[PDB]
C-alpha cells in the first residue's frame, strides 16, 4: 500500500492541526491539556510536577539531578509554562538583546527562548557566575533567567552576540580559541567567549583551549 | 416513552445505566434502543455512550455463553473460543484495545463496570 | 539622570577608599551596613 | 584584485563525493534537452569572500551525454 | 569568585569555572550507594604505604571465612551431573517407537 | 465544480497583480564595502 | 591556498561549515602552533606517546 | 443492607479541602476556539459545529444582547429528542446540501416552505463557496477532521484564487484584491509544487480534472537556465520524495 | 515547637515507643466483627465502602476491629501530649521519634497511618527523612525522595530542605548548592529564608572550591537586595561564622559591622555571637 | 564427531541455541513455544495439540494458546493498546506471556491495560465456567532477542508452578544456563521490574 | 546507524500519540455538536411558526 510521506517537522512530530487550514498555529497548550486528559488515577502512582524523560535511558547520570527527573511515558513532552517571546534575527541575537535590555531595567527574570545553543550558553554563564539561576529550564520553548545583582549594579556588564549583524556566522579555529584565551597580552578568564563544537556541546573558551578544539562562536559576556 | 418524548424531559445518565442493567439478553436491549429512537426522547451524550457500552457488554456475555455451550459438550475449547478471549468484539464503540475513549465524555474518567 | 545615584555615589566612594590614600568618612561604613532603599525588584 | 575572491572547496559535492580531483564528480539539475544525446546540467559551486567573510553559490552549466 | 582565578593560569582554577556539584555525585558509588571519596581506604592512603601494614590488616578479606569458604575448590567441573543425566537419558531408552 | 484559471494571466500579471517587494533584502556582495570581523569592529559600546 | 599549498582553512575565523569540514576545521586538522600538544598521531600511535 | 459502623472522632478541617477534567475541558475549548485570531475563529466557525457554544451554553453575543440572541417564545411542542443520526455528520463539511449545515434528518416535521427556505437556492455566497470547498474536502481528506493535507490546501488556494479573480473581473479598480491575488497565486504555486512531490497521483488528478496543465511553469528563461526553478525541489526538502520502486525500475 | 514539647515528655515518648513496637512486631487486622480476639489491641472505653463514599478516613471509623482499637490507643496517647491525631498531628510524632533514633518505629507508624486512610502527605515524608538527616545517611533520604515520587507526591520545599540537611550532615557541602540550583531550575520552587540559612551553613564549611566566601557574600547580598528578605539571627550567625575564618582585615571588618548591625536592628548578642 | 554427540545427547540444543540469542533469522519464539509445550506435556501428561492450541483433557484447565506473533502485528504508527504472544491458563491462573519488542516506543503499547486484562479474565470466566471469585491474570515480559536465566526461572515459577529442584529434575540443562540481562538495556530492565513485581489482578 | 534507528522509532511514536489525541478531539467535537444540535433545534422550533 502507498503511504503519504511525512514532510516537515510538524508532520514528522505528528501535529493534529486542530485549527482549520492553519499549519503554523501553535499547538503546545492544547496538546499538553489533552495529554493531561489522557492520564488516569489508578487505584488497586500518578505523576509529579517534576520534569520527565520519555525513556529510562534519558535520565541524567548525576544521582542528585536524577532526583528532580522522573520517567513519564508520553506525558514527558509539551512541558513548560512560558511561550516563545516576540517583539529577532537568530535566537542568540535576541537572547543577548533581551538580557542586555533587562539588565538596564533592573529586572529579576528574563524570558528568553530556549534552543540547543541558547540554554548551553546560559548554563556556561551560570557556571562562571554571571547568572543567579533559572526558571523552567526543561521547557523546550522558552526559559527564564534569574539575573544576579551585587551592590546596586548588575553582574553582567557587556553581553554581545558573535553574529553582530544577525546574519553572518563564524567558525572559530582552536587558534582562535587560544587567541581568545590570551587576548591583549594578558590571560583572559574574565571575558567568557562561548562556542558550540562539532559534537553539539556548548563550551567556553577555557575548556576549548584545554582540549584543543574550536567551534562555531555564539556570544561573549562579561 | 411516547409520553416522555412528548413532554420533552431528559433521561439522566444514572437512569439509562440502571435501565439497561435490567436487560438480560442482547435482543431485549435493541428493543429499548429502537423504542426510544421511535419515541424521540432526549438524553445526554454520556447517556448514549453508556447505552452503547451496555450493548457491547451484552454481546460479549452472549458469545461467552455460546462458546461455553460447545465447551461443556466437547471437553476442550476451540481456537475460535480462545480467540474470543483475546480479541472479543471488533466492531465496538468503546473497545478494550484502546482504553482512552471515555475520558472526555464521562466526568469520572472511567467506564461504568457492571457485575453480576 | 542616573549618574547621580546613591548606589553610584557609594560605588564611587568605595573605589575612592580602595586606593588606600583616601580616608573613609563614617557614613561610608555606616551605609555599607545600612544600604540605601531601592525602588527596583518590588 | 579587490575585493578578493577565491574558490571555496567545502560544499555539498565535497561532502558527498570523494573526488580524485576538483570537478570530477558533480551533482546538478537537467535544464535543457533540445540537443540529441546531450543533457544540459546546471550545477553550483561556492566562491569565498574573506573581506565580508561569506561564501556565495555561483552556477555553471555543463553539457553531459546520455546515449 | 576570587580575583586571582580570573587573571592567572593555574589549573585548579578550572575547578572554579564549573558549578558546585556533590562530591558523592562526581565520584563513583560503592556497594551501599553514594559514598564520600575519602571514606574508602585506597583513596586516602598513598600507594607507598600500602605494602607493609595494609595487607596485614586486609588479610581477613581474602584468607578468612567458613570451612566451605576455605576448604572447597571452586575450579572443579560444574556441569558433570547434567552430562551424566543426559548420557543416561540418551542411553537407557535406546529406541524410537 | 470548475477552475477557469489561466496560467498565462497569472505569469504575465494581468488584472494588475502586485506583489510587494521585501524591504532592503538584497544581500548582494557588490554593495558591501566594510570588513566583517567577529563581534563587529567595536563589540561592547556604552552610551554615556 | 589551492595549487601546491597545504593550508586548508583560514587561521582564526571562517564561514560556517558542515559535515566533515566542521569536524576538521575545529578539531582534526594539523596545528603546529599549539604550544601544549603536537598534531596527534593516528590510532594506536597516540596511546603510547601520551606522556 | 447492613448498617454502617460508628464514627468515633471527626474534625471539621478534614472537610475543609473531576475539577482537573473541568479545567482541562475549558482549557481545550480555549485553545481550540477562544485563543485564536478572528480570521481563524471564522474558519473554525465554518468548519466545526459548536465551537462558539461553551459549556455554560451562552454565547459572547448572548451575554450582552439577551433579547436578540435568545428565543422570544417558549413552545411546549414537538421535542425532537436526541440525535441518533449524529455519526454521519461530525463536521459541517459533511452536510452542505442545506443552509447553516443543517442535515436532512433535522428537517422532518416542518412544511415544505421551511425546507425550501433552507435549500441550495437560498444559500449565500459564503455558503456556496464553503460547499465548493467541502466538495473537494470530501474527496481529498485523510480523516474527517483533516483540513491541512496538501491536496486539500492546494485546492483551497485555487478556489481562493478563483474567488479573487472573479472579484477583480467585475471590479478591476480594487487595489487590495490585486495584492491578495498576487500572494494567493504564489501560495497556490507553493502548495501545488509540494503536492507534486509528496503525492504525485493526487497532483496529476487535480491537474487533469480542472484543465490547468501549465499551472507549474517557470516564469523567466534567464533564471530557468541556471537551474533555479528545480532548485526549489532541493531547498524545500523534496528532492528524494519519489519512491523509485513504484514508478521506475531503479536497477 | 510541639516536637520539642513531645520529646521532652518521657512518658508520652515511652507510650509512643510501645505503641510503635506493637505495630511493628505484629500489624493489626483490617477486619470486621470479633476484633477482640487478641490481647495486643484491646478495646478502649462495610467500613471501606463507608469510607469511600463520605470522604471519611479508615482510622476515623470504628468497626470494633484490631486496627480500630490500635487507632483508639494511638489517639489516646497522642492527645495526652497535646496533639490531635490528624495529618498535622502524626508529622509531630514521627519527627519526635526520628530525632531520637527510632527509624523503623516511625516508619511503622507512618505505614499504619497510610494504611488507615490518613494519606502519605509530603510532611509525613519530611518527618521520615528527618531520621536519615540527623543520622547523615544519604541513600535512605534519596530512597525516601524516590518513594514519595513513586506514590504521586511532588516534593515541596521541606523535602528538599531535609535532603540539603542530609547532605550537610554527611559532610557533602556543595551538594546543598546543587540541590538549591536544581530546585530553582527544575522543581520551580522559590527559596525561603531557611534555604538561604542552609546554603550559608553549607558554604561556611565548603572546601570544594576556592570561592566559598565571595559566593556567600554575593548570596547574602542577593537575599537582602534582590529577594527582599530581611536577615534574621540565623542568617547573621551563618554569615559571621564564615567571615570569622579568614584573617583578612576586610572580612573581619565585615564581621564587626555585621555584629553592629545585628545589635542595632534589635537582635541582642548571645553566646554564639560572642563566639 | 563432536556435533554428532551434541545432536545425539542434547535433544533440546536448538532451544538453548535460540534462547541464548544466537538465532538472528526468526528469534526464539518458536523455541519458546516448543519449550512450553514440552514442559506442559510433562506436567499435564494427557495432552492434545491442534495447530496453535495445546490442551490438557483432565477437566482442570491446562491450556496453551499461541495467539499471534508480536513482531509483525505491531504496526508502527497505530493506536492499539495490548498485543500478546502466548496465553496460558493453568488451573485458576491466567498468564499473558509477551516477548518485548526492539522498539522502545512500542513497549509501552505492547503491554495490555488493566481494563483489557479484566476483560480477558471475564472472557475466561465466561468460556471456561470458572467462577470469578478465584481468577487471577498477570502479565509477563520477556527479553526481545534472547532469554536469560532469571526469565526462565520466573517462567517456571509463575506459569508452570515449578520450583527450582523439580524444574532441574525435568530439565537437566537448566542448572548450567548462565545467561543474564545485558547492561546496555535500561528501559527493558525498568519495564520488567515494574511488570513482574505486580500482584495478580483479581476480577 | 543506531542514532538514525532511534530517530525513526521516535517518529513512529509521535504518529501513535497523534492518533490518540485525534480520538480525544473527536469526542470533544462530538459534545460540541450536541450543544449545537440543542441550540439549532430550539431555533427551528420557533422557525416552524
Helix axes B45-74, B79-86, angle to 10 degrees: 150
Establish whether chain G is in contact with chain E, requiring a minimum of 3 CB pairs below 8 angstroms.
Answer: no
H115 CB burial (10 A radius; 0-12, 13-18, 19+): middle
Please tell me which of the candidates K20, K24, K30 has its beta carbon nearest to residue B45: K30
CB contact C41 to I (< 8 Å) = yes
* Whether A166 contacts A88, CB under 8 Å: yes
Angstrom distance (rounded) from CA I43 to CA J103: 58
Indicate the pairing of strand A149-150 with strand A153-154: antiparallel
HEC string of I76-118?
Answer: HHHHHCCCCCCHHHHHHHHHHHHCCCCHHHHHHHHHHHHHCCC
* CA distances in angstroms from H41 to H50, H163, H237, I241, J151, listed in the order given: 12, 21, 31, 63, 56
Residues of G in contact with D10 (CB under 8 A): 17, 21
* CA distances in angstroms from H95 to H67, H131, H134, listed in the order given: 30, 9, 9
- Angle C12-C14-C18 (CA atoms, 0-180°, nearest 5)? 120
Rounded to the nearest 5°, which phi and psi values hold at H240? -125, 35
Give residues with Cβ within 8 angstroms of E20, minimum separation 6: I174, I177, I178, I181, I206, I208, I209
Taking the alpha carbons of J162, J166, J172, J174 in that order, is the dihedral positive or negative?
positive
What cell was used for E38?
Answer: 575519602
CB contact D53 to F (< 8 Å) = yes
- Using DSSP, state whether C40 is helix, strand or coil: coil
Most H CBs within 10 Å: which of F8, F18, F20, F22, as the mutation test of the H interface?
F18
Angstrom distance (rounded) from CA J140 to CA G37: 56
Q: What is the dihedral of CA I71, I76, I81, I86, to 10 degrees?
A: 40
J64 CB burial (10 A radius; 0-12, 13-18, 19+): buried
Please tell me which of the candidates H21, H76, H82 has its beta carbon nearest to residue B41: H82
* Residues on chain K bordering chain B, Cβ-to-Cβ distance under 8 angstroms: 20, 23-24, 27-28, 30-31, 34
Angstrom distance (rounded) from CA E85 to CA H59: 84
Give residues with Cβ within 8 angstroms of I145, minimum separation 6: A67, I129, I155, I159, I163
Rounded to the nearest 5°, which phi and psi values hold at B102? -140, 20
Contact partners for chain K, using 3 or more CB pairs closer than 8 A, are A, B, H, J
Establish whether chain D is in contact with chain K, requiring a minimum of 3 CB pairs below 8 angstroms.
Answer: no
Header resolution in angstroms: 3.3
HEC string of H195-242?
Answer: HHHHCHHHHHHHHHHCCCCCCCCCCCHHHHCCCCCCHHHHHCCCCCCC
Contact partners for chain H, using 3 or more CB pairs closer than 8 A, are A, B, D, F, I, K
CB contact H148 to K (< 8 Å) = no
Indicate the pairing of strand A171-172 with strand A153-154: unpaired
Angstrom distance (rounded) from CA H243 to CA H201: 12
Q: Compute the residue count for chain A.
A: 222
Q: Tally Cβ neighbours within 10 Å of residue J145.
A: 16
Give how far H82 is from chain F: nearest CA, Å.
Answer: 35
CB contact F40 to H (< 8 Å) = no
Contact partners for chain A, using 3 or more CB pairs closer than 8 A, are B, C, D, E, F, G, H, I, J, K
Taking CA atoms, what residue in A is nearest to G22? Answer: A198
Rounded to the nearest 5°, which phi and psi values hold at J59? 95, -35
Angstrom distance (rounded) from CA J8 to CA E91: 10
CB contact K9 to J (< 8 Å) = yes
Please tell me which of the candidates F2, F7, F18 has its beta carbon nearest to residue H182: F18
Please tell me which of the candidates C11, C35, C40 has its beta carbon nearest to residue A106: C40
Angstrom distance (rounded) from CA E42 to CA A109: 47
Contact E14 A186 (CB under 8 A): no
Give residues with Cβ within 8 angstroms of H11, minimum separation 6: I84, I86
Beta bridge partners of A111: A144
Exposure string over A124-163, b if 16+ CB within 10 A, otherwise e: bbbbbbbbbbbbbbbbebbbbbbbbbeebebbbeebbbbb
Angstrom distance (rounded) from CA A220 to CA A92: 11
Taking CA atoms, what residue in A is nearest to C33? Answer: A151
What cell was used for F46?
Answer: 556604552
Contact A42 J114 (CB under 8 A): yes
What cell was used for A35?
Answer: 495529554
Taking the alpha carbons of I24, I26, I28, I31 in that order, is the dihedral positive or negative?
positive
Please tell me which of the candidates H32, H148, H246 has its beta carbon nearest to residue A30: H32
Residues of J in contact with A71 (CB under 8 A): 190
Give how far J144 is from chain K: nearest CA, Å.
Answer: 16
Taking CA atoms, what residue in A is nearest to E3? Answer: A190
Cβ–Cβ pairs < 8 A, chains A and I: 71
Which helix (H) or strand (E) segment holds residue J201: the answer is strand J201-202
Rounded to the nearest 5°, which phi and psi values hold at H218? -70, 135
Give how far D43 is from chain G: nearest CA, Å.
Answer: 19
Residue with cell 580559541: A177
E14 Rama class: left (phi>0) / alpha (psi -120 to 50) / beta: alpha
Question: H helices of H60-106, where?
Answer: 66-69
- Using DSSP, state whether K46 is helix, strand or coil: helix
Which helix (H) or strand (E) segment holds residue D34: the answer is strand D29-35
- Angle A179-A183-A186 (CA atoms, 0-180°, nearest 5)? 125
Cβ–Cβ pairs < 8 A, chains D and F: 13
Angstrom distance (rounded) from CA H136 to CA I176: 63
* CA distances in angstroms from A79 to A52, A76, I157, J189, K22, listed in the order given: 8, 7, 21, 26, 20
Give residues with Cβ within 8 angstroms of I182, minimum separation 6: A64, A65, A67, A68
Beta bridge partners of A71: A53
Contact D52 A168 (CB under 8 A): yes
- Using DSSP, state whether H243 is helix, strand or coil: coil
CB contact I257 to C (< 8 Å) = yes
* CA distances in angstroms from J33 to J15, J45, J69, listed in the order given: 10, 17, 11
Give how far H159 is from chain A: nearest CA, Å.
Answer: 13
Most I CBs within 10 Å: which of E11, E13, E20, E39, as the mutation test of the I interface?
E20
Give residues with Cβ within 8 angstroms of A75, minimum separation 6: A35, A36, A38, A39, A47, A52
Angstrom distance (rounded) from CA A168 to CA D49: 12
Exposure string over I207-224, b if 16+ CB within 10 A, otherwise e: ebbbbbbebbbbbbbbbe
Does a cis peptide bond (omega within 30 degrees of 0) precede residue G44?
yes
* Whether A6 contacts H237, CB under 8 Å: no
CB contact H71 to I (< 8 Å) = no
Most G CBs within 10 Å: which of A117, A170, A173, as the mutation test of the G interface?
A173
Residue-by-residue DSSP string for B37-56: HHTT-EE-HHHHHHHHHHHH
CB contact E16 to I (< 8 Å) = yes
Please tell me which of the candidates A157, A162, A167 has its beta carbon nearest to residue F39: A162
Give how far A106 is from chain C: nearest CA, Å.
Answer: 6
* Whether B95 contacts B85, CB under 8 Å: no
Instruction: Return residues 1-48 of F near A (CB < 8 Å).
Output: 27, 36, 38-40, 43-44, 46
Angstrom distance (rounded) from CA J137 to CA J124: 10
What cell was used for A201?
Answer: 556541546
The two most distant CA atoms of chain J are separated, in Å, by 57
* Whether E31 contacts I184, CB under 8 Å: no
Angstrom distance (rounded) from CA J86 to CA A59: 33
HEC string of chain F?
Answer: CCCCCCHHHHHCCHHHCCCCCCCCCCCCCCCCCCCCCCCCCCCCCCCC
Please tell me which of the candidates E8, E14, E21 has its beta carbon nearest to residue A206: E14
H78 Rama class: left (phi>0) / alpha (psi -120 to 50) / beta: left
Indicate the pairing of strand A70-71 with strand A52-53: parallel
Amino acid at each position: 500500500q502507498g503511504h503519504r510521506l511525512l514532510h516537515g517537522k510538524r508532520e514528522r512530530e505528528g501535529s493534529l492541526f486542530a485549527v482549520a487550514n492553519d499549519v503554523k498555529r501553535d499547538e503546545r497548550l492544547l496538546r499538553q491539556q489533552l495529554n493531561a486528559l489522557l492520564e488516569e488515577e489508578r487505584m488497586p502512582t500518578p505523576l509529579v510536577d517534576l520534569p520527565g524523560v520519555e525513556r529510562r535511558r534519558d535520565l541524567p547520570a548525576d544521582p542528585i539531578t536524577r532526583l528532580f527527573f522522573q520517567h513519564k511515558g508520553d506525558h514527558a513532552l509539551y512541558y513548560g509554562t512560558y511561550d516563545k517571546p516576540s517583539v529577532l534575527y537568530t535566537p542568540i541575537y535576541d537572547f543577548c538583546h533581551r538580557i542586555r535590555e533587562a539588565t538596564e531595567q533592573r529586572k529579576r527574570f528574563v524570558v528568553v527562548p530556549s534552543t540547543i545553543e541558547t540554554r548551553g550558553c546560559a548554563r556556561v554563564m551560570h557556571d562562571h557566575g554571571l547568572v543567579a539561576g533559572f526558571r523552567d529550564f526543561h521547557n523546550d520553548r522558552a526559559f527564564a533567567v534569574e539575573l544576579k545583582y551585587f551592590q546596586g549594579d548588575s553582574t553582567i556588564n557587556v553581553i554581545e552576540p558573535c553574529s553582530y549583524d544577525g546574519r553572518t556566522e563564524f567558525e572559530w579555529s582552536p587558534k582562535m580559541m587560544r587567541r581568545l584565551l590570551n587576548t591583549h597580552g594578558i590571560h583572559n578568564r574574565l571575558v567568557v567567549y562561548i562556542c558550540r563544537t562539532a559534537d553539539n556541546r556548548i563550551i567556553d573558551h577555557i575548556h576549548a583551549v584545554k582540549e584543543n578544539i574550536g567551534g562555531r562562536g555564539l556570544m561573549m559576556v562579561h | 416513552m411516547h409520553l416522555a418524548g412528548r413532554n420533552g424531559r431528559e433521561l439522566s445518565v444514572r437512569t439509562i445505566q440502571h435501565l439497561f442493567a435490567r436487560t438480560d439478553s442482547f435482543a431485549e436491549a435493541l428493543a429499548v434502543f429502537y423504542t426510544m429512537r421511535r419515541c424521540h426522547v432526549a438524553m445526554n451524550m454520556e447517556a448514549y455512550y453508556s447505552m452503547l457500552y451496555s450493548l457491547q457488554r451484552l454481546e460479549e456475555e452472549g458469545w461467552g455463553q455460546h462458546f461455553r455451550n460447545e465447551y461443556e459438550e466437547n471437553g476442550a475449547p476451540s481456537e475460535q473460543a480462545m480467540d474470543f478471549i483475546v480479541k472479543g468484539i471488533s466492531n465496538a464503540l468503546l473497545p478494550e484495545n484502546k482504553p482512552w475513549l471515555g475520558r472526555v465524555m464521562f466526568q469520572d474518567r472511567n467506564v461504568p463496570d457492571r457485575r453480576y | 539622570n542616573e549618574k547621580y545615584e546613591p548606589w553610584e555615589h557609594m560605588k564611587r566612594m568605595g573605589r575612592l577608599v580602595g586606593t588606600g590614600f583616601y580616608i573613609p568618612p563614617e557614613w561610608y561604613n555606616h551605609f555599607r551596613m545600612f544600604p540605601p532603599i531601592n525602588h527596583n525588584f518590588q | 584584485q579587490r575585493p578578493r575572491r577565491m574558490p571555496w572547496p567545502y560544499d555539498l559535492t565535497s561532502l558527498i563525493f570523494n573526488q580524485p580531483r576538483q570537478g570530477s564528480d558533480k551533482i546538478g539539475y537537467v535544464v535543457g534537452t533540445s540537443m540529441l544525446k546531450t543533457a544540459v546540467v546546471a550545477t553550483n559551486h561556492m566562491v569565498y569572500y574573506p573581506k565580508f567573510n561569506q561564501r556565495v553559490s555561483r552556477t555553471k552549466r555543463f553539457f553531459a551525454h546520455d546515449e | 569568585k576570587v580575583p586571582h582565578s580570573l587573571i592567572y593560569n593555574i589549573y585548579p582554577y578550572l575547578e572554579e569555572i564549573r558549578r558546585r556539584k556533590g562530591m558523592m555525585a562526581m565520584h563513583p558509588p560503592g556497594k551501599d550507594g553514594l559514598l564520600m571519596p575519602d571514606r574508602v581506604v585506597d583513596n586516602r592512603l598513598p600507594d607507598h604505604l600500602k605494602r607493609g601494614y595494609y595487607d596485614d590488616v586486609y588479610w581477613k578479606d581474602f584468607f578468612a571465612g567458613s570451612d566451605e569458604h576455605l576448604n572447597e575448590p571452586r575450579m572443579g567441573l560444574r556441569g558433570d551431573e547434567m552430562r551424566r543425566r543426559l548420557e543416561e537419558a540418551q542411553t537407557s531408552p535406546a529406541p524410537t517407537t | 465544480t470548475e477552475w477557469k484559471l489561466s496560467p498565462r494571466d497569472i505569469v504575465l500579471r494581468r488584472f494588475g497583480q502586485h506583489t510587494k517587494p521585501p524591504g532592503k533584502a538584497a544581500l548582494d556582495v557588490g554593495s558591501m564595502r566594510g570588513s566583517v570581523i567577529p563581534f563587529g569592529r567595536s563589540p561592547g559600546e556604552q552610551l554615556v | 591556498g589551492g595549487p601546491g599549498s597545504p593550508v586548508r582553512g583560514p587561521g582564526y575565523y571562517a564561514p560556517p561549515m558542515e559535515g566533515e569540514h566542521q569536524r576538521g576545521y575545529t578539531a582534526e586538522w594539523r596545528d603546529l602552533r599549539n604550544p601544549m600538544r603536537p598534531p596527534e598521531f593516528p590510532t594506536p600511535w597516540e596511546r603510547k606517546y601520551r606522556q | 443492607a447492613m448498617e454502617h459502623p460508628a464514627i468515633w472522632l471527626w474534625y471539621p478541617w478534614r472537610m475543609n479541602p473531576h475539577m482537573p477534567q473541568r479545567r482541562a475541558l475549558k482549557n481545550v475549548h480555549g485553545a481550540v476556539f477562544n485563543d485564536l485570531t478572528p480570521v481563524q475563529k471564522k474558519r473554525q466557525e465554518q468548519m466545526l459545529y459548536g465551537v462558539n457554544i461553551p459549556e455554560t451554553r451562552q454565547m459572547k453575543f448572548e451575554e450582552q444582547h439577551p433579547l436578540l440572541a435568545g428565543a422570544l417564545r417558549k413552545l411546549e411542542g414537538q421535542p425532537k429528542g436526541f440525535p441518533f443520526w449524529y455519526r454521519k455528520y461530525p463536521t459541517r463539511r459533511h452536510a452542505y446540501e442545506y443552509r447553516f449545515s443543517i442535515p436532512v434528518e433535522m428537517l422532518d416535521g416542518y412544511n415544505d416552505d421551511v425546507k425550501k427556505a433552507l435549500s441550495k437556492g437560498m444559500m449565500s455566497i459564503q455558503e456556496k463557496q464553503f460547499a465548493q470547498e467541502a466538495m473537494y474536502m470530501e474527496r481529498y481528506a485523510e480523516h474527517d477532521f483533516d483540513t491541512t493535507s496538501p491536496a486539500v490546501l492546494a485546492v483551497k488556494r485555487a478556489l481562493k484564487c478563483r474567488v479573487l479573480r472573479n472579484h477583480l473581473l467585475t471590479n478591476p479598480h480594487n487595489n487590495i484584491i490585486k495584492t491578495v491575488l498576487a500572494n494567493t497565486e504564489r501560495k497556490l504555486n507553493h502548495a501545488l509544487r509540494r503536492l507534486r512531490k509528496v503525492d504525485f497521483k493526487k497532483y496529476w488528478e487535480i491537474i487533469r480534472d480542472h484543465d490547468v496543465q501549465d499551472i507549474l511553469q517557470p516564469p523567466n528563461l534567464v533564471t530557468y537556465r541556471q537551474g533555479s526553478y528545480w532548485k526549489y525541489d532541493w531547498n524545500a526538502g523534496l528532492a528524494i520524495s519519489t519512491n523509485l520502486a513504484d514508478v521506475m525500475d531503479p536497477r | 515547637d510541639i516536637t520539642k514539647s513531645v520529646e521532652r515528655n518521657a512518658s508520652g515518648m515511652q507510650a509512643l515507643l510501645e505503641i510503635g513496637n506493637k505495630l511493628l512486631r505484629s500489624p493489626p487486622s483490617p477486619e470486621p466483627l470479633s476484633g477482640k480476639a487478641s490481647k495486643l489491641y484491646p478495646p478502649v472505653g462495610r467500613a471501606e465502602e463507608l469510607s469511600a463514599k463520605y470522604n471519611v478516613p479508615m482510622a476515623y471509623i470504628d468497626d470494633s476491629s484490631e486496627a480500630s482499637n490500635a487507632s483508639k490507643s494511638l489517639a489516646l496517647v497522642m492527645e495526652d501530649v497535646g496533639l490531635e491525631f490528624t495529618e498535622d498531628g502524626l508529622t509531630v510524632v514521627i519527627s519526635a521519634l526520628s530525632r531520637q533514633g527510632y527509624g523503623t518505629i516511625g516508619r511503622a507508624i507512618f505505614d499504619f497511618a497510610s494504611a488507615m486512610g490518613l494519606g502519605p502527605s509530603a510532611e509525613m515524608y519530611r518527618a521520615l527523612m528527618k531520621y536519615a538527616s540527623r543520622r547523615g545517611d544519604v541513600n535512605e533520604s534519596m530512597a525516601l525522595i524516590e518513594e514519595m515520587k513513586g506514590n504521586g507526591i511532588t516534593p515541596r520545599i521541606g523535602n528538599w530542605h531535609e535532603l540539603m540537611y542530609t547532605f550537610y550532615k554527611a559532610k557533602d557541602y556543595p551538594a546543598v548548592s546543587q540541590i538549591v540550583d536544581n530546585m530553582k531550575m527544575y522543581a520551580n520552587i522559590e527559596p525561603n529564608e531557611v534555604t538561604f540559612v542552609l546554603q550559608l551553613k553549607a558554604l561556611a564549611k565548603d572546601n570544594s572550591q576556592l570561592n566559598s566566601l565571595p559566593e556567600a557574600i554575593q548570596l547574602f547580598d542577593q537575599m537582602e537586595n534582590v529577594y527582599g528578605f530581611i536577615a534574621s539571627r540565623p542568617h547573621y550567625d551563618a554569615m559571621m561564622f564564615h567571615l570569622s575564618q579568614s584573617p583578612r582585615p576586610e572580612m573581619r571588618l565585615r564581621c564587626e559591622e555585621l555584629a553592629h548591625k545585628m545589635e542595632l536592628m534589635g537582635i541582642v548578642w548571645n553566646a554564639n555571637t560572642y563566639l | 564427531e563432536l556435533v554428532a554427540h551434541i545432536v545425539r545427547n542434547y535433544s533440546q540444543i536448538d532451544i538453548i541455541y535460540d534462547f541464548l540469542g544466537f538465532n538472528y533469522s526468526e528469534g526464539y519464539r518458536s523455541s519458546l513455544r516448543r519449550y512450553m509445550e514440552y514442559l506442559q506435556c510433562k506436567t499435564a501428561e494427557n495432552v492434545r495439540a491442534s495447530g496453535r492450541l495445546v490442551t490438557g483433557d483432565k477437566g482442570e484447565h491446562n491450556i496453551l494458546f499461541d495467539y499471534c506473533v508480536s513482531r509483525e502485528s505491531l504496526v508502527s504508527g497505530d493506536s492499539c493498546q495490548g498485543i500478546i504472544d502466548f496465553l496460558y491458563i493453568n488451573g485458576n491462573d491466567v498468564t499473558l506471556i509477551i516477548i518485548a519488542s526492539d522498539n522502545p516506543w512500542l513497549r509501552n503499547r505492547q503491554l495490555p491495560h488493566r481494563r483489557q486484562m479484566e476483560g480477558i479474565a471475564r472472557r475466561v470466566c465466561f468460556v471456561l465456567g470458572i467462577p470469578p471469585s478465584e481468577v487471577r491474570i498477570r502479565n509477563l515480559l520477556l527479553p526481545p532477542t534472547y532469554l536469560d536465566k532469571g526469565s526462565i526461572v520466573r517462567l517456571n515459577d509463575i506459569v508452570f508452578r515449578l520450583s527450582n529442584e523439580q524444574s532441574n529434575l525435568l530439565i537437566p540443562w537448566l542448572t548450567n544456563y548462565n545467561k543474564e540481562l545485558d547492561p546496555k538495556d535500561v528501559d527493558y530492565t525498568a519495564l520488567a521490574k515494574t511488570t513482574n513485581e505486580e500482584e495478580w489482578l483479581t476480577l | 546507524e543506531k542514532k538514525r534507528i532511534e530517530a525513526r522509532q521516535m517518529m513512529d511514536g509521535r504518529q501513535a500519540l497523534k492518533k490518540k489525541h485525534l480520538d480525544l478531539l473527536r469526542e470533544f467535537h462530538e459534545r460540541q455538536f450536541f450543544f449545537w444540535y440543542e441550540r439549532a433545534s430550539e431555533r427551528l422550533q420557533n422557525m416552524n411558526l
